[PDB]
Amino acid sequence: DPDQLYSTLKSILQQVKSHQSAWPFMEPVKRTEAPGYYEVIRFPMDLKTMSERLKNRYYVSKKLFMADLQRVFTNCKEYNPPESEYYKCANILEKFFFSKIKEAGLID
Ligand SMILES: CC(=O)NCCCC[C@H](N)C(=O)O
Structure with a gap:
């Protein structure tokens, strides 16, 4: 486990x-x-x-891992303008991320 x-x-x-x-x-x-x-x-x-x-x-649960990665995205979207390359990357990578999370069957 x-x-x-x-x-x-x-x-x-x-x-x-x-x-x-x-x-x-x-x-x-x-x-x-x-x-x-x-x-x-x-x-x-x-x-x-x-x-x-x-x-x-450190990542003893799904929720700890998700929170750190989500933090990566929300920092980026707080700091950077909405049409910046940095913001676009955040949303692209976040979509990729969620697809891999579903693909793994990862639940709490
Ligand atoms: C991942 C991330 O948010 N990086 C910051 C990019 C900085 C952009 C520009 N040089 C600025 O100072 O706002």
Whole structure:
């Protein structure tokens, strides 16, 4: 059961990371790219951090994994204009994400 979740989550995270719209979210947002970001966004999240958390056995439920990935998207949509490339990527990758969640049969 626990390594069952672990495997599923690792597979899903890896596919999200490989996706072509994942590039904005691969590492923590850099100050040099976004100077006042950490002044606007209280709970930053990215896919590198999510990989470490996964390896650190933090994702003991569906809901913890979903909340971190959802945070990636909602940060991006709070910070960035609606027609920005960053916003478009967020919605594209979110659709991909949900398709892989259904495909896995992942429930709480
Ligand atoms: C994933 C994410 O939201 N990245 C931030 C992109 C920053 C865009 C631009 N340079 C800015 O400072 O608003």
